[PDB]
Structure 1
Amino acid sequence: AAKDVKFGADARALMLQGVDLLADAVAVTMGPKGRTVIIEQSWGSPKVTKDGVTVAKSIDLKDKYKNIGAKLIQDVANNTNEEAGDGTTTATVLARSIAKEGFEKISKGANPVEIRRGVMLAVDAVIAELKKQSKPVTTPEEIAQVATISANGDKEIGNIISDAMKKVGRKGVITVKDGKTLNDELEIIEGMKFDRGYISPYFINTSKGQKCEFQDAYVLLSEKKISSIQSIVPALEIANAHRKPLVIIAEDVDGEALSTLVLNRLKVGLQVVAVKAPGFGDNRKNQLKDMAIATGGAVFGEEGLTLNLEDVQPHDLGKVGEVIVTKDDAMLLKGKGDKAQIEKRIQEIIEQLDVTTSEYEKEKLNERLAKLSDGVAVLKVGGTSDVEVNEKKDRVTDALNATRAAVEEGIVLGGGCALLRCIPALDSLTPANEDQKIGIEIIKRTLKIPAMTIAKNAGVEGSLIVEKIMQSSSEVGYDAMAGDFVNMVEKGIIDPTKVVRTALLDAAGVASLLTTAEVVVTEIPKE
């Protein structure tokens, strides 16, 4: 395939045009007074979004040279989103600033690689200053404030996130889902709920709600399928001798045993119910073992130390205070396992979490830990249509990510003032040569961009706002929603440190390497 080659200023200008287009599209969404972007979808209704990475990923250019800069800015935004989950618009604007200022300074005598070295040095100094300015989060009010700021000033979302974190802990499992009503809802799931229904309608004993409900029930855990009458009769005899209900959690129940169970339930009133084992693969075994420790029972059919159903004993069965089974899910609430064994299992899970990490494995381990310790939380997002619901879920996810980041690390001032307060740290550096000085100056000029963008979206002159902020005391910043100068921490305009440093590092890392190019090679368009 034939190719086209460009040198120097023309190539730099075309790439800067692409970068400027993508960054201009992204920048309109930043701050409390930003606006939304509508993106055409090929299979239905368009998206309406206020999210930087979503807007960035949706733009592809016809010209081959502009698309290079567009793709690099997309890489910046995607890396920021993957690492922190928030702060992608800030990263995009910082990257454009660095790229433009770098391109403006290239000449015959310049050495772009040394300029890149100076840029990296300055960014390291800035990150050190940011880490020195951070403070830890200690109160639920700070959690609510962070969530409110991340959700674009919505107090209800912050309140619901704070309540969820209070109920399931600051490191618990919280998920976001679509709602079917006009309003948002918070649902707390306690105990062990594994989403498996009763095998046969004949086991129902509660008319209102169509539920099978038992109290003080024996639990029979079977790793392998139950088929024969010989393997099932002893458990029924044990249960009937003591006059207690029995819940059989097993891989499956076959025709003969199921027929015996239904016949006894119908003609004797025997209190029994059967359910499938949850999870597939080794996860099924892990869940069954977790239930075994939780209820104080044993697992039958294990490959190691195989325990036979034929000689089941009364002490091999778990005990649960309440069992609720319905068509879609089942729940055992109050097990009777030994606390020490449960704590040992929790310790084993949290140690396994630290050994090898993957999204699937981490998700499963966290779910197991939550089911065994504290429970899970579900936030249901409401709205009148799919477009509104998706738009609001974007903000809810941003708020959750920001709150987790602010729990892992501290908080700094919001509104772009945190980066403004790091400018004095760059005045202490002594560059080795002229190119590193150029890089340091590039970073020093770039550090003002976020506050100016926020002020510009608000309809005021950003440069005057930044000048007045820099002339005030360290605790004072600009409230763009109210349009005033206030004490940022007292008003709750705060940001996570991790998001800020991640955005700065990614933007600098990509833009400084972009500004070192001299030749660009592209493919000639096909017919």
Structure 2
Amino acid sequence: GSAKDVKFGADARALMLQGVDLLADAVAVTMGPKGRTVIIEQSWGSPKVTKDGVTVAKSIDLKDKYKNIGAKLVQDVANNTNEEAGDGTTTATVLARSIAKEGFEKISKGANPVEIRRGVMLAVDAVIAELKKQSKPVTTPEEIAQVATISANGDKEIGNIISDAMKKVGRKGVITVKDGKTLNDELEIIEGMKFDRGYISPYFINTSKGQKCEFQDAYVLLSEKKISSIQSIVPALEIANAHRKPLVIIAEDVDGEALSTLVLNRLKVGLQVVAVKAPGFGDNRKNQLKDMAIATGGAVFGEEGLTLNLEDVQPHDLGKVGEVIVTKDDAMLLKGKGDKAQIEKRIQEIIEQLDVTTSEYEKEKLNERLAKLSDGVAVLKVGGTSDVEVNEKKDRVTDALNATRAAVEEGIVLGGGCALLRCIPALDSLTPANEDQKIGIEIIKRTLKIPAMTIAKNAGVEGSLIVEKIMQSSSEVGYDAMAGDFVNMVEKGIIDPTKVVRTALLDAAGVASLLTTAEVVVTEIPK
């Protein structure tokens, strides 16, 4: 209904490119081992110092609406790359800027930008297939330490402590990063668990940074069925509210008036409470229910063998824990006060049931339940002299954990932008169907040099000469930008997770090649 401004063609495209260029120029200075940091003013408290690309991209909004559209699209690129990979957001930003620039340069009257986008997506699929061909799996703890060191801006202690954490709790174990009070980082092994069900309502969030629910020393209330009626929840809520510990309800499906009562009590008087769906289906859900009820030292409600009701809930049937974290991705329960002999009896029963399984799917879930109650979780405490230092370091530790998980999942390729450089002959062999698809393929071919050029540019040398020397070199040779030398990248440990590279390329290509199809931009008139 508000009045709009409509711009056409080249002028609108140049304004959107100005926004893209501003955000990408801010992000690109943080790339590689000689990248520098960005200081972001906060409304409350101290400014934030970061090297993280999506953090810089999310903090930049522009007054000019036409520039802000391009800034928001590159912000979408960085956020999507952060969501499905956890690393590589700066690479995705510079790739998206390169694709948008090359697409805007190649638009004429006879050009078909939608078919150019088709050629871009075909070229990116070819590059991703070549990246999967080039990938090799991680087999050693040394490779894990190398991935974590590279992803932490060359910090070898971060790599060492992440490698030690995955040596203790396993390559698929739960690792947690929080603040540290000391000067140095430290690794702690504690009894905790984590399942793959987040929150249900978005109104249980108090920590505004990670968008997670952080309660400490909480009450735990399990259920087999759904804790449903008002007469079945007013006792539970009244005892769990009067007693000074927050409530964690584990139910099946929570969407309704008990949930809205929880939201309203959080709003008005501040009731600390959360409701979580129960992971697993069939008897696996009930077995994990019993496992968590024993581990928390509480009780199972609405079951079949006891028929315990929720109208008579006693204070001795609620589990006591020392921390619960409810992200939208997972739920995490640390330092339960369950009975030690009960946990040992449950682990002996799980061993007895492990001895009598041969179906290769029941045994996998039984081993998962065995490694939940016994292997424990790892907690990384990040040290530093101030909150701004600790937050800056925590960004890199989170990046390194995400990259190491990605590398365990999907393997490793050469670092320093060389993995994308070695996929250019995969695009040389392609046969385009028309001129527009050839334009798109050549756009991707030019874009593949951008990460290595950006790393070399931040190191203070001429990136085009570096990239030309790499392309003229053998496939194992690349540019150590920290030492300023052409080395064997795998031997020197300058390696990247394959998932991160292909994620950054795909997420940049889709959004940027869609943006380059635009003829008309409609914005709201600024009041």
Deviations 1:388-416 (A, max 9, x none): 00000000000000000000011000000
Q: Please state whether the residue corresponding to 2:5 is helix, strand or coil.
A: strand
Q: Given the two structures, how large is their TM-score scaled by the length of structure 2?
A: 0.72
Q: Please state whether the residue corresponding to 2:321 is helix, strand or coil.
A: strand
2 CA distance for matches of 1:489 and 1:264?
56
2 CA distance for matches of 1:203 and 1:80?
26
Deviations 1:105-160 (A, max 9, x none): 11111111111111111111000100000000000000000000000000001110
1 CA distance for matches of 2:264 and 2:106?
87
The higher radius of gyration belongs to: 1
Distance 1:474 1:109, change over 3 A: same
Distance 1:498 1:222, change over 3 A: closer
- The equivalent of 1:95 in structure 2 is 96
How far off is 1:224 after superposition?
A: 15
1 CA distance for matches of 2:129 and 2:328?
56
Distance 1:489 1:124, change over 3 A: same
Distance 1:426 1:347, change over 3 A: farther
Contact 1:370 1:376 in 2 (8 A): no
How far off is 1:289 after superposition?
A: 2.0
How far off is 1:426 after superposition?
A: 0.6
How far off is 1:239 after superposition?
A: 29
Map 1:354-503 onto structure 2 (within 5 A).
370-503=371-504
1 CA distance for matches of 2:267 and 2:520?
83
| Greater Cα offset, 194-203 or 472-481 | 194-203
1 CA distance for matches of 2:227 and 2:5?
70
Contact 1:218 1:320 in 2 (8 A): yes
How far off is 1:314 after superposition?
A: 23
How far off is 1:163 after superposition?
A: 0.5
Distance 1:14 1:288, change over 3 A: closer
Q: Please state whether the residue corresponding to 1:216 is helix, strand or coil.
A: coil
Distance 1:398 1:353, change over 3 A: farther
Distance 1:521 1:347, change over 3 A: farther
Distance 1:349 1:20, change over 3 A: farther
2 CA distance for matches of 1:269 and 1:52?
35
Deviations 1:290-330 (A, max 9, x none): 26778999979955335899999999999999999999999
5+ unaligned residues in a row in structure 1: which ranges?
none
Contact 2:126 2:426 in 1 (8 A): yes
Deviations 1:70-120 (A, max 9, x none): 010001110000010100000000000000001101111111111111111
2 CA distance for matches of 1:254 and 1:8?
47
5+ unaligned residues in a row in structure 2: which ranges?
none
Aligned pairs, number: 526
| Greater Cα offset, 113-122 or 239-248 | 239-248
| Greater Cα offset, 87-96 or 349-358 | 349-358
User: Are 1:240 and 2:241 matched, yes or no?
Assistant: yes
Distance 1:502 1:217, change over 3 A: closer
Contact 1:227 1:256 in 2 (8 A): no
Q: Given the two structures, how large is their TM-score scaled by the length of structure 1?
A: 0.72
Q: Please state whether the residue corresponding to 1:292 is helix, strand or coil.
A: helix
| Greater Cα offset, 433-442 or 348-357 | 348-357
Distance 1:460 1:306, change over 3 A: same
User: What stretches of structure 1 move > 6 A for 4+ residues in a row?
Assistant: 191-288, 291-301, 307-369
User: Are 1:172 and 2:173 matched, yes or no?
Assistant: yes
- The equivalent of 2:40 in structure 1 is 39
Distance 1:66 1:372, change over 3 A: same
Q: Please state whether the residue corresponding to 1:273 is helix, strand or coil.
A: strand
1 CA distance for matches of 2:213 and 2:514?
65
Contact 1:227 1:254 in 2 (8 A): no
Distance 1:323 1:393, change over 3 A: closer
Distance 1:348 1:386, change over 3 A: farther
Deviations 1:43-65 (A, max 9, x none): 11100000000000011111111
How far off is 1:26 after superposition?
A: 0.6
Distance 1:495 1:256, change over 3 A: closer
Q: Please state whether the residue corresponding to 1:197 is helix, strand or coil.
A: coil
Contact 2:227 2:310 in 1 (8 A): no
Q: Please state whether the residue corresponding to 1:187 is helix, strand or coil.
A: strand
2 CA distance for matches of 1:430 and 1:380?
53
Q: Identity percentage over the alignment?
A: 100
